[PDB]
């Protein structure tokens, strides 16, 4: 039975805030289709070839 | 069938008599008189546009 991840509560309070001290520039890749093959069919030739 | 017959370099086995591509369409044939393999290319076709 899958975990869904590692459980990690947060030390929440009404008066305790966490500020980051150091930062990382990361690079990620996102990929998307833009078009497809421009297929074409001669119905006449296909159905009744000669 | 119909097409253009051309010389080929495909080494058909002695018992082999036909060639087919992924489409199972005839690819090449061996002359019954000369044990030579000839490729079949469908005749040039397409569509005329203006
Ligand atoms: C911020 O973080 C980066 C990396 O997380 C720190 O850069 C490293 O600094 C250590 C010094 O302890 C070097 O040994 C490493 O070679 C550094 N790596 C890179 C990729 O730069 C940087 O010093 C941190 N800065 C602060 C102010 O915390
Ligand atoms: C029969 O085929 C062979 C193979 O090409 C050829 O050499 C022979 O000449 C053919 N027969 C005749 C009578 O030509």
Coordinates of C-alpha atoms and ligand atoms in Angstrom, one line a residue:
Chain A
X1 CA 0.0 0.0 0.0
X2 CA 1.7 3.1 -1.2
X3 CA 3.0 5.7 1.2
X4 CA 2.1 9.0 -0.6
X5 CA 5.4 10.3 0.8
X6 CA 7.3 10.7 4.1
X7 CA 5.2 12.2 6.8
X8 CA 6.5 15.5 8.0
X9 CA 4.5 17.7 10.4
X10 CA 5.5 21.4 10.9
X11 CA 6.5 23.0 14.2
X12 CA 3.8 25.5 13.8
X13 CA 3.2 28.1 16.4
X14 CA 1.6 31.5 16.8
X15 CA 5.0 33.2 17.1
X16 CA 7.7 31.2 15.4
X17 CA 8.7 31.8 11.8
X18 CA 11.3 30.1 9.7
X19 CA 13.3 32.3 7.3
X20 CA 15.7 30.9 4.6
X21 CA 19.3 31.8 4.9
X22 CA 20.7 30.4 1.7
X23 CA 19.3 29.9 -1.8
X24 CA 19.9 27.7 -4.8
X25 CA 19.4 28.4 -8.5
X26 CA 18.1 25.2 -10.0
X27 CA 17.3 24.2 -13.6
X28 CA 14.4 22.0 -14.6
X29 CA 13.2 20.6 -17.9
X30 CA 9.6 20.8 -19.2
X31 CA 8.6 19.1 -22.4
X32 CA 5.6 19.7 -24.6
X33 CA 4.4 18.5 -28.0
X34 CA 3.8 21.2 -30.6
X35 CA 2.6 19.4 -33.7
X36 CA 2.3 16.0 -35.3
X37 CA 3.2 14.4 -38.7
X38 CA 1.2 16.0 -41.5
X39 CA -0.2 12.8 -42.9
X40 CA -2.3 12.7 -46.1
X41 CA -4.4 10.0 -47.7
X42 CA -5.9 9.6 -51.1
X43 CA -9.2 7.9 -50.2
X44 CA -9.8 7.0 -53.9
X45 CA -6.4 5.3 -54.4
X46 CA -6.5 3.7 -51.0
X47 CA -9.9 2.0 -51.2
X48 CA -9.8 1.1 -54.9
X49 CA -6.1 1.0 -55.7
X50 CA -6.2 0.6 -59.5
Chain B
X1 CA 1.0 -6.2 -58.8
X2 CA 2.1 -2.9 -60.2
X3 CA 5.3 -1.0 -59.5
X4 CA 8.9 -0.4 -60.6
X5 CA 11.3 -3.3 -60.5
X6 CA 14.9 -2.5 -59.7
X7 CA 18.1 -4.3 -58.8
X8 CA 18.6 -5.1 -55.2
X9 CA 21.3 -6.2 -52.7
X10 CA 19.1 -8.2 -50.3
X11 CA 20.4 -11.8 -49.9
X12 CA 17.3 -13.9 -50.0
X13 CA 17.6 -17.5 -48.7
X14 CA 17.4 -20.2 -51.3
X15 CA 14.0 -21.3 -50.2
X16 CA 12.8 -17.7 -49.7
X17 CA 10.7 -16.4 -52.6
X18 CA 9.2 -13.1 -51.4
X19 CA 10.0 -10.0 -49.4
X20 CA 7.6 -8.1 -47.2
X21 CA 8.0 -4.9 -45.2
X22 CA 6.3 -4.2 -41.8
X23 CA 3.0 -3.7 -43.7
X24 CA 3.3 -7.2 -45.1
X25 CA 3.2 -5.6 -48.5
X26 CA 5.4 -7.1 -51.2
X27 CA 8.9 -5.7 -50.9
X28 CA 11.0 -7.6 -53.4
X29 CA 10.7 -10.8 -55.5
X30 CA 13.0 -13.3 -57.1
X31 CA 12.8 -13.9 -60.8
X32 CA 11.8 -17.6 -61.4
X33 CA 14.3 -17.7 -64.3
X34 CA 17.2 -15.9 -62.8
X35 CA 17.9 -16.3 -59.1
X36 CA 18.2 -12.6 -58.6
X37 CA 16.3 -10.3 -56.2
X38 CA 14.4 -7.3 -57.5
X39 CA 13.0 -4.6 -55.3
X40 CA 9.4 -3.4 -56.0
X41 CA 8.8 0.4 -55.5
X42 CA 5.2 1.6 -55.8
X43 CA 4.9 3.9 -58.9
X44 CA 5.4 7.6 -58.3
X45 CA 2.1 9.2 -57.1
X46 CA 0.7 11.9 -55.0
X47 CA -1.5 14.9 -55.5
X48 CA -1.4 17.9 -57.9
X49 CA -1.9 21.3 -56.3
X50 CA -2.0 24.8 -57.6
Ligands
LIG1 C1 25.1 28.9 0.3 O1 25.1 27.6 -0.1 C2 26.2 27.2 -1.1 C3 26.0 25.8 -1.5 O2 24.8 25.3 -0.8 C4 27.5 27.5 -0.5 O3 28.5 27.3 -1.4 C5 29.5 26.3 -0.9 O4 30.2 26.9 0.2 C6 31.2 25.9 0.8 C7 31.8 26.6 1.9 O5 31.4 26.0 3.2 C8 32.2 25.5 -0.3 O6 33.0 24.5 0.3 C9 31.4 24.9 -1.5 O7 32.4 24.6 -2.5 C10 30.4 25.9 -2.0 N1 29.6 25.3 -3.1 C11 29.1 26.0 -4.1 C12 28.4 25.3 -5.1 O8 29.2 27.3 -4.1 C13 27.6 29.0 0.0 O9 28.8 29.2 0.7 C14 26.4 29.2 1.0 N2 26.5 30.6 1.4 C15 26.0 31.0 2.6 C16 26.1 32.5 2.9 O10 25.5 30.2 3.4
LIG2 C1 16.8 -21.4 -67.9 O1 17.3 -20.5 -66.8 C2 18.7 -20.5 -66.7 C3 19.0 -19.6 -65.5 O2 19.0 -18.2 -65.9 C4 19.3 -20.0 -68.0 O3 20.7 -20.0 -67.9 C5 18.9 -20.9 -69.1 O4 19.4 -20.4 -70.4 C6 17.4 -21.0 -69.2 N1 17.0 -21.9 -70.3 C7 17.1 -21.6 -71.6 C8 16.6 -22.6 -72.5 O5 17.5 -20.5 -71.9

